[PDB]
Paper text:
To date, 16 mammalian galectins have been discovered, and galectin-7 (Gal-7; also termed p53-induced gene 1 product), belonging to prototype galectins, is a multifunctional effector by productive pairing with distinct glycoconjugates and protein counter-receptors in the cytoplasm and nucleus, as well as on the cell surface. Gal-7 participates in diverse processes, such as controlling apoptosis, cell migration and cell adhesion. Gal-7 was crystallized in complex with glycerol under two different conditions.
The two refined structures, structure 1 (homodimeric Gal-7 binds two glycerol molecules) and structure 2 (homodimeric Gal-7 binds three glycerol molecules), were crystallized using two different conditions, one at a relatively low concentration of PEG3350 (12%) and the other at a higher concentration (20%). It indicates that glycerol is a small ligand of Gal-7. Discrepancies between structure 1 and structure 2 in monomer A are due to the absence or presence of GOL C. B-factors of structure 1 suggests that the N-terminal regions are very flexible, while the N-terminal region of structure 2 is relatively stable due to the binding of GOL C. Just like Gal-7 structure 1 in the crystallization condition (20% PEG 3350, 0.2M magnesium chloride, 0.1M HEPES, pH7.5), no electron density of glycerol was found in GOL C sites, but glycerol electron density was found in GOL C sites in structure 2 of Gal-7 under another crystallization condition (0.1M HEPES, pH7.5, 12% PEG 3350).
Author numbering:
A (entry chain B), B (entry chain A): 2 to 136
The structure:
């Protein structure tokens, strides 16, 4: 494992930016995450932390600012399964991020940090990442 | 076998809206269309008319305002084939519609009508639809 994926967003992201993540959850995965970060330094603020937790069957959403985590939000269940492929859309809108899993909107995360600060996508944890694409 | 597919959008669509269309272009297909319409009336204004033409090997984009069509825009060649499945994203931003076809950004259509007018997605013509989803 032990390596996160990083993708720069040269144009930043605006309402209408779509991140498509395709991958599969390894059969003994505990957790993985997708972070929208505001810069390339290791403590940088996270506009969005999307963290499916399959050892506890839940999906946590949060933000991180000046080094401290915000309040956890969480969706209905976990739309991921060990050993199973997935396709996630993270869609930037004017008032938040829409997290789509499969064929259904899973959660709407209202913006906590300004959208214009987001500068990179990071994908880490127990996941087999097939493809990260920005549209 | 096939039918005009309508998705009603009573709250409209906002920037950061993804229309995902999956289907088959059947073996003898001439052309098909995805319309973002402003109402349910016959001949409603169209914010976007997306029109792959298999018979002429072009993809046409246009609008229909106040009864008459605008000037057509064309994408580069035809990324559709008779007898092949496809995935199209139509992504609404503040300034236009982004068309993605099978992992490749394909064309950008600047708004000609205010996005707020859109009330209905219609998919018709020579296509065998798998799914239409609006996120």
């Amino acid at each position: 494992s032990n390596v996160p994926h990083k993708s720069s967003l040269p144009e930043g992201i605006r309402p209408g930016t779509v991140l498509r993540i395709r991958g599969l959850v390894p059969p003994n995965a505990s957790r993985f995450h997708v972070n929208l970060l505001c810069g390339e330094e290791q403590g940088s603020d996270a506009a969005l932390h999307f963290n499916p937790r399959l050892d506890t069957s839940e999906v946590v959403f949060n933000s991180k600012e000046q080094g401290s985590w915000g309040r956890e939000e969480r969706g209905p269940g976990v739309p991921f399964q060990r050993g199973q492929p997935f396709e996630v859309l993270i869609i930037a809108s004017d008032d938040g991020f829409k997290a789509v899993v499969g064929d259904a909107q899973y959660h709407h995360f209202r913006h906590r940090l300004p959208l214009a600060r987001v500068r990179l996508v990071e994908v880490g944890g127990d996941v087999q990442l097939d493809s990260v694409r920005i549209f």
